[PDB]
Amino acid sequence: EKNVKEITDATKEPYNSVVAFVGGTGVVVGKNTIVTNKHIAKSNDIFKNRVSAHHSSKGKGGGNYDVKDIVEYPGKEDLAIVHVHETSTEGLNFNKNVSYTKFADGAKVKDRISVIGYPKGAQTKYKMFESTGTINHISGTFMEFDAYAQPGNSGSPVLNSKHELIGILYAGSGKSEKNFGVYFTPQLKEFIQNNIEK
């Protein structure tokens, strides 16, 4: 499917749970806590760059926050928890500027979904886009779906028709409307929830 539209004002739910990292996307799931791919969290710990809360071309900025630490999922699944320092260098409070996305507790093949993130962010001044499609396959912690996705979408939340979080994108395929995600099973949900700051 190729139905991709810019979210010009991402201060509204659920767009204000989406965050931009230099080369990808993450989603806020609880107090000071973001989910994204492993390499996005990791390569960010080399330059120690900030994460921007819901950057969009027209929306009031949500702040740019420093990373406190990362917790990688132990398994091979491409999932990492990123904790941020609650107060930005500009005195903005992360929790006042984002929302926490709720879990879907799974999905089904043929479900209609949205992938929201920053495709080609370094070429667009980090415009947020939502891309719609359908879940084509679910197995274990793997899912495939056909929403158009590009470089910049790794870590993007995949949402259901009620704006709840099913998983996150981790990869495309070939030369992309056949894209792969981490599908959140109870085990991955429990991993995430156990690692939200109290």
Side-chain angles (χ1 to χ4, degrees), residues 1 3-41 43-47 49-57 59 61-71 73-95 97-107 109 111-174 176-197:
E1 184 161 336
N3 273 315
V4 181
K5 296 297 167 157
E6 180 182 3
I7 304 307
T8 56
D9 186 331
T11 65
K12 312 311 187 174
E13 305 187 347
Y15 308 110
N16 63 344
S17 69
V18 178
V19 297
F21 290 79
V22 158
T25 302
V27 60
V28 183
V29 290
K31 179 183 193 197
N32 309 321
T33 305
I34 292 155
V35 171
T36 187
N37 289 158
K38 293 173 162 169
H39 73 94
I40 296 290
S43 299
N44 194 68
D45 253 12
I46 283 134
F47 279 82
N49 276 114
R50 298 173 314 211
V51 294
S52 177
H54 67 69
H55 189 261
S56 60
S57 67
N64 311 129
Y65 296 85
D66 300 298
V67 172
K68 173 201 173 153
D69 61 46
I70 301 154
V71 186
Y73 182 67
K76 278 198 129 149
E77 282 89 351
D78 195 353
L79 175 67
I81 292 324
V82 168
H83 293 126
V84 291
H85 286 299
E86 190 165 355
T87 310
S88 78
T89 59
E90 302 301 328
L92 290 181
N93 179 285
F94 181 77
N95 304 297
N97 280 282
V98 303
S99 63
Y100 308 152
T101 286
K102 298 194 171 61
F103 285 89
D105 305 319
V109 181
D111 283 357
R112 300 283 300 159
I113 49 83
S114 288
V115 178
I116 301 170
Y118 293 98
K120 309 302 289 169
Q123 290 67 230
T124 64
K125 303 183 185 170
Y126 295 95
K127 291 179 174 30
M128 183 181 296
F129 285 93
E130 174 172 5
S131 174
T132 58
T134 298
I135 290 168
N136 312 120
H137 181 88
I138 297 162
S139 61
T141 56
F142 171 90
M143 62 182 171
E144 169 181 332
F145 46 87
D146 64 19
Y148 186 87
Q150 292 190 269
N153 274 125
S154 286
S156 288
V158 181
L159 306 192
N160 71 8
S161 69
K162 304 177 279 272
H163 301 307
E164 299 165 338
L165 182 62
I166 298 162
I168 55 179
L169 188 148
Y170 77 88
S173 72
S176 193
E177 295 165 43
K178 181 181 178 72
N179 296 301
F180 304 136
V182 184
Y183 177 79
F184 296 164
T185 52
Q187 303 62 37
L188 296 194
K189 175 177 170 182
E190 176 186 65
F191 167 74
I192 298 166
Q193 289 184 322
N194 293 345
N195 291 282
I196 290 169
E197 302 200 339

